[PDB]
Design a protein around this ligand. Structure first.
Ligand SMILES: Nc1ncnc2c1ncn2[C@@H]1O[C@H](COP(=O)(O)OP(=O)(O)OP(=O)(O)O)[C@@H](O)[C@H]1O
Ligand SMILES: Nc1nc2c(ncn2[C@@H]2O[C@H](COP(=O)(O)OP(=O)(O)O)[C@@H](O)[C@H]2O)c(=O)[nH]1
Ligand SMILES: [Mg+2]
Ligand SMILES: [Mg+2]
Ligand SMILES: [Mg+2]
Lengths: 132, 80, 208, 51, 352, 101
């Protein structure tokens, strides 16, 4: 139909999101074909979706359609946040993009689960030590 | 039985029985003695209602399917 | 940490960036140019740019969280805030016009003021001298005062004295008491002050 | 918890595909499992375990 | 008073009033709504010291239908549906206020899910040994039914003789208040008193004595599953419960002289996913067949005008205490977090 | 020439169990059902119990084929953990490397 859009990708833990941000819209976000308040009942997840648009002061001006698979509810919201922010960079100014980067909105979070090592209870947790 | 059927057939269904009964009571309230099964179930309005019910029963229920069913029932029940 | 030392913490402040260049000083301008060349950490999943974001309440929610159940911890905090607001609204509606003026109905003002009232000005540190342990009066850092107020309030609500009372009701009751300079948490502050004033002669034991 | 039609269609499919046709409890179904596989002692891993 | 309307008569509400909050008098709250209102809305009435209801299109549409009801024709089943927290219950309450103020007899079931779960005392029915009585649920409803329709309880007179015990029996020609009082006083006879009340009202509405509104919220419970279990621990079925068996009969369109307004609700439903809201998804096959033909009415999230009036009503009452809530930036955040959902907006504004 | 007498006893058990597997399978089928009369099933109970003890498959032990170690054996290679590691650490097992991640 000739409507501008920008596809991007995001990643958080084991989640991976693909976001299509339309240049013009009403503020509608669809996650896996579902309205975001239904797909994300927890308020914290919806707050993460609002962080990219609020920071650039463009709430209600774009329509997003995203697909996220893998991970948990929080990881999926974090993955979608990254996908939306990177896609939205096309429509904001270069200076605004730099502010987004300096605000943490364009960095892939490398913090992933640490493996468990043999001879220990957890990644860092050790078995109870007995001096005697 | 109807439980075994994998495709909903409006004929000899509860919908057909229920709409027929409702229409017969409506005629009695108007004091009209035209109670012929065939005539009542041959009207175009019944055809719209049959189509809507079959769609709802055999295809994915969506908002559009419930709006079409709404308008079909409103015509048969003289609700405006 | 999975972040290299070069990575810098994100600054999630909308107003900072909008500040016109003319307002910026020469040193402030250098800070902006330097940040453009620096790697930045991904923003954590807690703090956002929302106007309704309060760091103190965010810290309090985290201090109440058990086993990573932030949903329950956040639920308790919002239930407490609504309880304080509803209780103050009842007190306001049942009060006279003159009294109604002095009744505070903002749950966030009450929460901040109640915690500030519970902050201890002075602390006690155990010190070993001559084989004996002495509690020596010491000045407390600003971070340690705020943490102590929050920890004392949470510990009081978690006490067994309260029987089958839900945390939103317990915490709202305690917060309103502290807002009026009353209750057990305030007594804990006064006890610390009175135990440090009594040990004022041991202040010289401190070497820093 | 099946209709007569469903029950008789299931019994026809079982006859078509070679499954048990008579009503058989889970205990007696072991006889089918016993004769559909080799006994553990008859598997080459077992009797040819050692060189 | 931008968010408020001065028309407090629910019979005079039209499209001009969409978005404006109309005040329900304290007297009506005690009489018309001893129990219908949602739990969190009841908190608001206590806190604000007033009950104000936004005039919305779902109710306006359903008030239009009820103003043009042909009392000769069989009663029409109106079903309010919509997503969780969209305002189905309070749309039903707005209509109940209309019919109550027009001297209709109100048969309001506040929540039908309560009749199919968490029952401590499930007694075997004496009238029919294969059915179960729910004394506590029946007695609770009977007291409220008495409160709302106290005016009519003397005029309506039973047309049969009902044997309660060997000793006691209600005689033909006595007022229906006696049947209600027996169930309330003697709680073992409450379930049967509800059955008789429903049986009498259905018969006597057709005779043209009064207009009967059957307002059942959470109707999808009637044709679902129960969490009530027998002594042997086998799952009981909704039909076996006497209260459900008797209420199902009220839902059929084999009587005239009134209307049957119902609302769906996934909240409190049994064995339904969180995001189920469409009629057939919640009613099921048996439920849809019982109500077909019915008129579905959609309830949606607030529209831009309605959302602004809701914030203005909260601001007028000083409910929004955060200093940034009155600002345009705060409102944008309020809108995004809820997406104009009435229930999410009320819950988020409750602690701001 | 087997590693030890214990391995030799397991070799004989695996052989006897193989010889009796069909007969044991047939008799067990008679017992493992509710169709046949209990009188017949009781005679089958005695018949399978009278078969030589070393025909019972549960008596077979998966010992290391190289050293006869009765525990710590990896079933895919039939080797004890000590012998498997000796071959793996010398690069003599195709495709097996030290795991680091
Ligand atoms: N017409 C209205 N006027 C005022 N407030 C309303 C109205 N409709 C909804 N609300 C607000 O939204 C809340 C939810 O309303 P309601 O209980 O009617 O929703 P519902 O769709 O029936 O919910 P559920 O799906 O859980 O049954 C109310 O408590 C109230 O705060
Ligand atoms: N105790 C008592 N209950 C009655 C009597 N008549 C009716 N009821 C109750 O009212 C309900 C409605 O009556 P009816 O239509 O006869 O019920 P049905 O026999 O179950 O179809 C019954 O299910 C009973 O619970 C009566 O004589 N005594
Ligand atoms: Mg651990
Ligand atoms: Mg509802
Ligand atoms: Mg063994």
């Amino acid at each position: 139909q000739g409507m501008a859009f920008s596809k991007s990708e995001g990643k958080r833990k084991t989640a991976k999101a693909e976001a299509i941000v339309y240049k013009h819209g009403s503020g509608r976000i669809k996650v896996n074909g579902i309205d975001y308040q239904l797909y994300f009942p927890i308020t914290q997840d919806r707050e993460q979706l609002m962080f990219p648009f609020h920071f650039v002061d463009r709430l209600g001006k774009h329509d997003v359609t995203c697909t996220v698979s893998g991970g948990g509810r929080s990881a999926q919201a974090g993955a979608i946040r990254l996908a939306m922010a990177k896609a939205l960079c096309s429509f904001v100014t270069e200076d605004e993009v730099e502010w987004m980067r300096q605000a943490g909105l364009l960095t892939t979070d490398p913090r992933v689960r640490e493996r468990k090592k043999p001879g220990q209870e957890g990644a860092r947790r050790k078995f109870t030590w007995k001096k005697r | 039985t109807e439980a075994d059927m994998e495709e909903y057939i409006w004929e000899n269904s509860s919908s057909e029985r229920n709409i027929l009964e409702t229409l017969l009571q409506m005629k009695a309230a108007e004091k009209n003695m035209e109670i012929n099964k065939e005539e009542l179930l041959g009207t175009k309005e019944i055809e719209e209602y049959k189509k809507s019910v079959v769609s709802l029963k055999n295809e994915e229920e969506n908002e559009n399917s419930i709006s079409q069913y709404k308008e079909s029932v409103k015509r048969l029940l003289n609700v405006t | 940490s999975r972040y290299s030392p070069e990575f810098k913490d994100p600054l999630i402040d909308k107003e900072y960036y909008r500040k016109p260049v003319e307002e910026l000083t020469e040193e402030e301008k250098y800070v902006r140019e330097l940040k453009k060349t620096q790697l930045i950490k991904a923003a954590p999943a807690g703090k956002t740019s929302s106007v309704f974001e309060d760091p103190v309440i965010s810290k309090f929610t985290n201090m109440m969280m058990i086993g990573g159940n932030k949903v329950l911890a956040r639920s308790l905090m919002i239930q407490t805030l609504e309880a304080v607001k509803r209780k103050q609204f009842e007190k306001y509606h049942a009060a006279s016009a003159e009294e109604q003026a002095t009744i505070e109905r903002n749950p966030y003002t009450i929460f901040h003021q109640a915690l500030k009232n519970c902050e201890p000005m002075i602390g006690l540190v155990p010190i070993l001298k001559g084989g004996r342990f002495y509690q020596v009066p010491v000045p407390l850092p600003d971070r340690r005062r705020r943490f102590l107020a929050m920890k004392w309030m949470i510990t009081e609500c978690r006490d067994k004295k309260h029987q089958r009372t839900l945390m939103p009701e317990k915490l709202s009751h305690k917060l309103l008491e502290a807002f009026h300079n009353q209750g057990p948490v305030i007594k804990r502050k006064h006890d610390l002050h009175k135990m440090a004033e009594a040990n004022r002669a041991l202040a010289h034991y401190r070497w820093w | 918890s099946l209709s007569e039609y469903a029950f008789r269609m299931s019994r026809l499919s079982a006859r078509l595909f070679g499954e048990v046709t008579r009503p058989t409890n889970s205990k007696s179904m072991k006889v089918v499992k016993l004769f559909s596989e080799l006994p553990l002692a008859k598997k080459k891993e077992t009797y040819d375990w050692y060189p | 008073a931008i968010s408020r309307t001065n028309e407090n008569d629910p019979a005079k509400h039209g499209d001009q009033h969409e978005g404006q909050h109309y005040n329900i008098s304290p007297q009506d709250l005690e009489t018309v709504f001893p129990h219908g209102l949602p739990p969190r809305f009841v908190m608001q009435v206590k806190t604000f010291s007033e009950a104000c209801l936004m005039v919305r299109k779902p109710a306006l549409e359903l008030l239009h239908y009820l103003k043009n009801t042909s009392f000769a024709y069989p009663a029409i089943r109106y079903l309010l549906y919509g997503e969780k927290g969209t305002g189905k219950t309070l749309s039903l309450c707005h209509v109940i206020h209309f019919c109550a103020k027009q001297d209709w007899l109100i048969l309001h079931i506040p929540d039908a899910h309560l009749w199919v779960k968490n029952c401590r005392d499930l007694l075997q029915s004496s009238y029919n040994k294969q059915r179960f009585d729910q004394p506590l649920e029946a007695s609770t409803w009977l007291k409220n039914f008495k409160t709302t329709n106290e005016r009519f309880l003397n005029q309506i007179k039973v047309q049969e003789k009902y044997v309660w015990n060997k000793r006691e029996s209600t005689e033909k020609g006595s007022p229906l208040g006696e049947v209600v009082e027996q169930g309330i006083t003697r709680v073992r006879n409450a379930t049967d008193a509800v059955g008789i009340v429903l049986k009498e009202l259905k018969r006597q509405s057709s005779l043209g004595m009064f207009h009967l509104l059957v307002a059942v919220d959470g109707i999808n419970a009637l044709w679902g599953r129960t969490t009530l279990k027998r002594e042997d621990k086998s799952p009981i079925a909704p039909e076996e419960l006497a209260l459900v068996h008797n209420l199902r009969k009220m839902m059929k369109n084999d009587w005239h002289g009134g209307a049957i307004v119902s609302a769906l609700s996934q909240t409190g439903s049994l064995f339904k996913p969180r995001k189920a809201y469409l009629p057939q998804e919640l009613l099921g096959k048996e439920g849809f067949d019982a109500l077909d033909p019915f008129i579905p009415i959609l309830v949606s999230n607030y529209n831009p005008k309605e959302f602004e009036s809701c914030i203005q009503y909260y601001l007028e009452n000083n409910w929004l205490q955060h200093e940034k809530a009155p600002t345009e930036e705060g409102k944008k955040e309020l809108l995004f977090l809820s997406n104009a959902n009435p229930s999410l907006l009320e819950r988020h504004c409750a602690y701001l | 020439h087997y590693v030890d007498w214990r391995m030799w006893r397991d070799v004989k058990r695996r052989k006897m169990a193989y010889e009796y597997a069909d007969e044991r399978l047939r008799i067990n089928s008679l017992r493992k059902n509710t169709i046949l009369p209990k009188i017949l099933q009781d005679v089958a109970d005695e018949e399978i119990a009278a078969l030589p003890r070393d025909s019972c498959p549960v008596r077979i032990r998966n010992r290391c084929v190289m050293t006869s170690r009765p525990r710590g054996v990896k079933r895919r290679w039939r080797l004890s953990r000590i012998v498997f590691r000796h071959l793996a650490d010398h690069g003599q097992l195709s495709g097996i490397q030290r795991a680091t991640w």
